[PDB]
């Protein structure tokens, strides 16, 4: 008996890769008589033809590692491969910082805390890279 | 029928990447000899195949305990794991 | 490739010529298709 044609129809009827269709060893004769796709669906319901499950990579080990790193672990000098600028894009970091500082200065202005003029003086200094962070900006504002 | 212990140390004579194959041959030859039967008449139950190939084609176990029976008109043997 | 209608007619003819000398011609002539072509071993025109 040769069931390669039936393997192809089965893969299509079960909608799976041929490598996953399973033909019951004890029914090669009946599967061999299966000529049409209907003959195949018939055998499928009988359970004579089934589809093996596909695997998915486990992500458990990955998740534990993700937690350690999110917590700041497993990133010592011996675990880095890329250059510093590759690990964190400097222009991208500046965009983050500068936007955070401008948002801060903007809230203080609408809030009345800063006069448009004091706001300007601080805004222009921020743009000139005067403050390392938001906290650094606040500390400065507090004289 | 009896339980025998087959040493597979002679599989080391074959290249390492093919130890499993040679093992299955040694097993057939051992039974054929010790049960006084033709190698062609010795049947190895898949259980034995899976035991020898357990660690891949290059890492066979050093021995294997096998349970074999001998009978029929032409003289044959049927063997399996234990 | 893209075959035109005519190209297709020519290919069809070539395929037809690739049949064998009918059995009866053998008996009648009391005893080969010289123009036997193979898609791989040979090369058609165009």
């Amino acid at each position: 008996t040769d069931l390669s044609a039936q393997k192809r129809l089965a893969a299509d009827v079960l909608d799976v890769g041929k490598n996953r269709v399973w033909f019951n060893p004890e029914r090669q004769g009946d599967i061999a008589d299966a000529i049409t796709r209907e003959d195949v669906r018939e055998l499928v319901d009988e359970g004579a033809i089934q589809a093996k499950d596909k695997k998915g990579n486990s992500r458990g080990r990955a998740r534990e590692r993700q937690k350690k790193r999110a917590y700041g672990h497993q990133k010592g000098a011996g675990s880095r491969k890329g250059k510093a600028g590759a690990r964190q894009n400097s222009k991208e970091d500046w965009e983050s910082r500068i936007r955070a500082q401008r948002t801060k200065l903007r809230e203080l202005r609408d809030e009345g805390t800063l006069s448009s003029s004091q706001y300007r003086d601080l805004y222009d200094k921020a743009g000139g890279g005067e403050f390392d962070s938001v906290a650094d900006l606040e500390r400065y504002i507090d004289a | 029928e009896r339980v025998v212990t087959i040493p597979l140390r002679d599989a080391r004579a074959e290249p390492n990447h093919k130890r499993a194959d040679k093992a299955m041959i040694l097993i057939r030859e051992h039974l054929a000899k010790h049960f006084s039967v033709d190698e062609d008449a010795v049947r190895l139950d898949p259980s034995i195949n899976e035991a020898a190939w357990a660690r891949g084609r290059a890492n066979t176990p050093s021995k294997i305990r096998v349970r074999a029976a001998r009978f029929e008109e032409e003289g044959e043997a049927i063997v399996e794991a234990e | 490739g893209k075959k035109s209608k005519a190209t297709k007619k020519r290919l069809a003819k070539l395929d037809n010529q690739n049949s064998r000398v009918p059995a009866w011609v053998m008996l009648k002539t009391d005893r080969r298709n010289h123009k036997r072509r193979h898609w791989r071993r040979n090369d058609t025109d165009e």
Binding site: - | - | K8, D15, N16
Partner: protein, 81 residues
């Protein structure tokens, strides 16, 4: 003067088209259009043609798949020839 219909195309696939879709298949002159095939078929078997699909075959001929109206019955039509 070349004729449109050459002969019924009778094969397993044709029979199914006939039993299940009320369609008739013909070998026709490759110079014939879908419209000329429709007219010819109606005038030959006194039926109503709903749709005509064509194909220039690797046999150098044209095959036509003619669907008849629900008013007609392909099985019966093809059976009288």
């Amino acid at each position: 003067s070349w004729d449109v219909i050459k002969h019924p195309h009778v094969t397993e696939k044709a029979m199914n088209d006939m039993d299940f879709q009320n369609k008739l298949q013909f070998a026709v002159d490759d110079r014939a259009s879908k419209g000329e095939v429709a007219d010819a078929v109606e005038e030959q078997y006194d039926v109503t043609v709903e749709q005509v699909n064509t194909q220039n075959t690797m046999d150098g001929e044209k095959k036509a798949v003619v669907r008849l109206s629900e008013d007609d019955d392909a099985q019966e039509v093809a059976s009288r020839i």
